[PDB]
């Protein structure tokens, strides 16, 4: 049996690469994006009622995932290389209009094709008795060079995004060598940082 699916829309995302995408995205509220809905579902009628829903599940295609074991069985993990290649994420819904959802705390790559939107239903989706021994790091302290703080603010005004907060929230989640400069792309920016101490990240510069 084969079943054909097609995207209802595509993600526009802060994240351009898989590296600094936080392992706990709901602790990164500055990780924002939009879901641009495709012409059939771009009518506000398809969204009515979501004004009373804070979080939504997105089923999507791992389009940048280019598999039965993972060095752990594939079905015991959330690996991106898996049969049928469908991902599942719960993100916070900040608002919506005809043909667009505003999202926060996302873990989705830019351009991600979305297959479905489901409202998060707490009594059904939040399993209090759930345990998982296979499944997080506490988080590293983040410090700013004075130059980078000014640059994050300027680009935050230009992009109308919480750039400084996003940089801090992704670096704090431990995306190892002293002296070496590291980098990541966020929106249209290149962010550089280093490890002055093994337990401290310092943001060097924000360019774009």
Ligand X SMILES: Nc1ncnc2c1ncn2[C@@H]1O[C@H](CSCC[C@H](N)C(=O)O)[C@@H](O)[C@H]1O
Residues lying near its own copies in the complex (CB under 8 A)? 1-8, 24-26, 38, 40-41, 43-50, 52-57, 59, 61, 67-69, 72-78, 82-86, 88, 90, 113, 115-136
Q: Is 168 exposed, middle or buried (0-12, 13-18, 19+ CB in 10 A)?
A: buried
Q: Nearest approach, Cβ of 1 to its own copies (angstroms)?
A: 6
Name the residue with tokens 């898989």: 18
- In angstroms, give the least distance from the CB of 179 to its own copies: 33
Q: Does 78 bind ligand X (CB under 6 A)?
A: yes
DSSP bridge pairs for 186: 15, 189
CB of 80 to ligand X, least distance (A): 4
107 contacts ligand X (rule: CB under 6 A): yes
Give the x-and-dash track for 165-184 against ligand X (CB under 6 A). --------------------
Block residue for tokens 């900040």 = 94
Minimal distance, residue 172 CB to its own copies, in Å: 15
Question: 115-132 burial, b if ≥16 CB within 10 A, otherwise e?
Answer: eebeebeeeeeeeeeeee
Both tokens of residue 31?
């990780």
Q: Is residue 18 a contact residue for ligand X (CB under 6 A)? A: yes
Q: Is 109 in the site for ligand X (CB under 6 A)?
A: yes
* Alpha carbons 178 and 108: distance in angstroms, whole number: 30
In a 3-state reduction of DSSP, which class is residue 139?
coil
């Amino acid at each position: 049996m084969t079943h054909s699916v097609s995207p209802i829309g595509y993600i526009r995302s802060c994240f351009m690469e898989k590296f600094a995408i936080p392992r706990q995205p709901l602790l990164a509220p500055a990780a924002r994006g939009t879901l641009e809905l495709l012409p059939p579902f771009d009518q506000v009628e398809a969204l009515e009622g979501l004004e009373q829903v804070s979080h939504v599940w997105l089923l999507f295609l791992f389009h940048q995932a280019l598999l039965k074991v993972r060095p752990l069985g594939v079905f015991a993990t959330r690996a991106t290389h898996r049969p049928n290649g469908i991902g599942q994420s719960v993100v916070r819904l900040e608002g919506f209009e005809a043909g667009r959802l505003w999202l926060s705390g996302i873990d989705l790559l830019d351009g991600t094709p979305v297959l479905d939107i489901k409202p998060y239903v707490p009594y059904a989706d939040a399993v209090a008795d759930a345990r998982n021994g296979i499944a997080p790091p506490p988080g590293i302290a983040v410090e700013w060079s004075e130059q980078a703080r000014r640059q994050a603010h300027e680009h935050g005004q230009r992009l109308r995004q919480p750039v400084a907060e996003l940089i801090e929230q992704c670096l704090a989640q431990d995306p190892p060598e002293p002296g070496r400069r590291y980098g990541v792309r966020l929106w249209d920016l290149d962010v550089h940082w280093h490890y002055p101490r093994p337990d401290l990240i310092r943001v060097l510069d924000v360019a774009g």
